[PDB]
Write a protein that binds this DNA or RNA. Structure first.
Lengths: 91, 91, 102, 78, 96, 78, 90, 96
DNA sequence: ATCACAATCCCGGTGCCGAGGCCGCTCAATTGGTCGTAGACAGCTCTAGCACCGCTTAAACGCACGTACGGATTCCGTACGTGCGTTTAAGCGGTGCTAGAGCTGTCTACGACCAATTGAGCGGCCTCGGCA
DNA sequence: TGCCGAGGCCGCTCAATTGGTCGTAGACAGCTCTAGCACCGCTTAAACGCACGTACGGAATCCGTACGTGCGTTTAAGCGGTGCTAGAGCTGTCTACGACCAATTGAGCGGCCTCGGCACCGGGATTGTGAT
């Protein structure tokens, strides 16, 4: 559990993105294909979408870790994500 | 004088339920609901007019506002009803 | 001859228009069809909620819609629950006891 | 199938920055579904904004307005 | 002598109070509390009865929802008894 | 006067929430919670009242304050 | 295109005379200022709506600040606005 | 003599008056001192945020403010954290 | 599996308060011209989004291995729950008093508009010091 | 160690300041009638203190598995170039419908009246509870 803590410190230290750009761009275009055929995206739009998604997921993981700590555990599980997203009302 | 939405809500109720009644408290609740939802739609329409640098609110803006707020399977039917009303009125 | 009658609605097109012009920005206008669309939207939403509440009241064998029936109808549908997030006065809560408590 | 392009190490990194020390192997599918739902909502609103302006290119402005509609206000692009 | 085993009357109360729609805080004590709380912000205030009624209803709804989230938190920890720590977790995850 | 919110009242408010067993330390915590909530709402109500130059607090001030806080209330004029 | 870059820079050099700011931080500040202005304008217009008024004045902005800003921020913002208005009328 | 000098501020009173007039009072009019008060509030809040950001930057021994310093300043104060709840692009997270 | 029992649902009666309908008036919805001004439409263009290809290599993936941790089991004492007797403070009806919210009439301070002038922001170019 | 960006000089151009006009929003004074507040007497109900006892939270133990770590191979992301073309943005025209105004008439807002539907009480029917 040492490397996990070192990575935790290092990743809260930095400020860069954690999802690779091309897979996320392909995912975004595939998602948007179902809404309006033949759409185009500026680079700024995809970058903003990635920023928002990363912030959202990090916050959700903080809430999930709190739920896990509540049950006297250290490993997060799907149940903790579900409790976090049910208390917030995101369900 | 203080205008209220009682008449039209009662007309709708007697349209879709020709035997059930409504209470004074339920009347107040429906008044509040209609006022709140109208305020939401009007605010979204005003913001939409501002974004495109327009000045005239139009049924296009109301359609887009309805599509923005109301959740799915409600946006479709609401847009259908609104389009039917607009087409009849133009006729 | 009323605009709502020409549009075949119950909600007033003219009064909705008057309330719309009082929400715009400076030098702002409101098309006559915006009132038509908004009146149709309000009529549809009120019809949906009222039909659900009437069904809920018919279940309990009563002739009047109360705050309780409105809460039962709104909290019993996903769309209306997501859209309406208000505190219905005197509506109580939907009865539910968790399984691990029994 | 590009939702699988959010690789497991990337989810591990996101969870590490959030303070999670140990992760169950069942987390990754849940995270992928959560991300897909969020992206779907935001992209739907952005595409609606683009359509109302009668265009075919999604600017950063559409994304920012869509995010603000959801109460996820984002600075730096607005 | 008849005694119900501890746990039955709790469920009976749960059903009864989930069936009703009335207010559950006594009117006069809540009015007194509201007046004393408002005494800080302003001196010599007057309260319409509907102001106090609206405040009471909002408070009751808030507390009921908070208790439901707390019960979810308690059941999560494999318990049946709600505790202050579960209230604190429910309030922190909510953002409040 | 906050002590006037009795233990059975909190028990009833918990029963409406589906709570079957209530710790003995719940009541003080719930009293603090309610005090904070009321202090947040009454402040905005009095702000509206003072802006209107009125010496009385009306139902509409409470409704507007609640809508501001994100706790919209139906059945009191707003 | 209109922006608050020059005024933000002047305020910055008023606070920290020996500190510069990057373009991205300027964008952050521009968005922040625009958001706060939008909130204040909306609250003031709503306050005019509630009391059946038609003119936004110093009272409406003061009540909007009292409603929006938390705690000591509201107090000091109210003080600064009062000082500015008293200087302007003089 | 621009109205800013009469008010002794740094933000544009005239432009803020125009911006307030655009949103107006739903077809109404905007008072004379509304612009002065609005500009004063904007200047005060910007000064507070920039002072905190400059302190954070100096603590990191750099000669220029970055979004990371802005988030460090905003999340380091309770009231600025309550008032501002947006996502700042490029700021990272507060170590915890 | 059995059976007495506190407790809850069901059916019937009543009489009480709230919904539903009807009148009268008044405020605003509707109509017809004028006019203008905010937007639909046709062109031009040059920006920027997208489709190829190579290539460098840092990130991801498959596999082995061991140990930290989550889950079932057991045990026990204490905090809760249940029921009873006493009490104490809310709730209701009546009485009275007075602050004060609300409407109206005058008028007077204030803000919108236009014509002119000019001055402060915005974009272009460049560079030398902050930073990765 | 440079390179990549921010701070400064410069070009005009659009909007901010003067000033007179002119209509009107709201400040203020005055009166009115509502409604908030205070007090008092009864009286039934809910709260509080207490005794007793079962269930439950929490700890201690044990064990199997599942998750982290390390290593070697693979891959596809990112950079770097290249042509190419839709289409976002801007300009100009001309015009289609929404605002202002005068006149008018009907739909809705208060007020009132009446009866019927919902609420409480009371007696049988039932239904889980808990000891046997």
């Amino acid at each position: 559990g040492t490397v996990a803590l070192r990575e935790i410190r290092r990743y809260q230290k930095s400020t860069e993105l954690l999802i690779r750009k091309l897979p996320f761009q392909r995912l975004v275009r595939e998602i948007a294909q179902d809404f309006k055929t033949d759409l185009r995206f500026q680079s700024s739009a995809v970058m903003a979408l990635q920023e928002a998604s990363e912030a959202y997921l990090v916050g959700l993981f903080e809430d999930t870790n709190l739920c896990a700590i509540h049950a006297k555990r250290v490993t997060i599980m799907p149940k903790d994500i579900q409790l976090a997203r049910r208390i917030r009302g995101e369900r | 004088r203080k205008e209220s939405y009682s008449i039209y809500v009662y007309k709708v109720l007697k349209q879709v339920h020709p035997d059930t009644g409504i209470s004074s408290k339920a009347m107040g609740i429906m008044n509040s609901f209609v006022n709140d939802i109208f305020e939401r739609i009007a605010g979204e329409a005003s913001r939409l007019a501002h974004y495109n640098k327009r000045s005239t609110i139009t049924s296009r803006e109301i359609q887009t506002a309805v599509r923005l707020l109301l959740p799915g399977e409600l946006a479709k039917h609401a847009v259908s009803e609104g389009t039917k009303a607009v087409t009849k009125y133009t006729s | 001859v009323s605009r709502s009658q020409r549009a075949g609605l119950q909600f007033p097109v003219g009064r909705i228009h008057r309330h719309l012009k009082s929400r715009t920005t400076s030098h702002g206008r409101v098309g006559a069809t915006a009132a038509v669309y908004s009146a149709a939207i309000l009529e549809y939403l009120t019809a949906e909620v009222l039909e659900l509440a009437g069904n809920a009241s018919k279940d309990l064998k009563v002739k009047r819609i109360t705050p309780r029936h409105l809460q039962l109808a709104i909290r019993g549908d996903e769309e209306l629950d997501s859209l309406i997030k208000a505190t219905i006065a005197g509506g109580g809560v939907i009865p539910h006891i968790h399984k691990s408590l029994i | 199938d590009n939702i699988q392009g959010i690789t497991k190490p990337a989810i591990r990194r996101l969870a590490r920055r959030g303070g999670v020390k140990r992760i169950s192997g069942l987390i990754y599918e849940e995270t992928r579904g959560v991300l897909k739902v969020f992206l779907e909502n935001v992209i739907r609103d952005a595409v609606t904004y683009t359509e109302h302006a009668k265009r075919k290119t999604v600017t950063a402005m559409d994304v920012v307005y869509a995010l603000k509609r959801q109460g996820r206000t984002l600075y730096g692009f607005g």
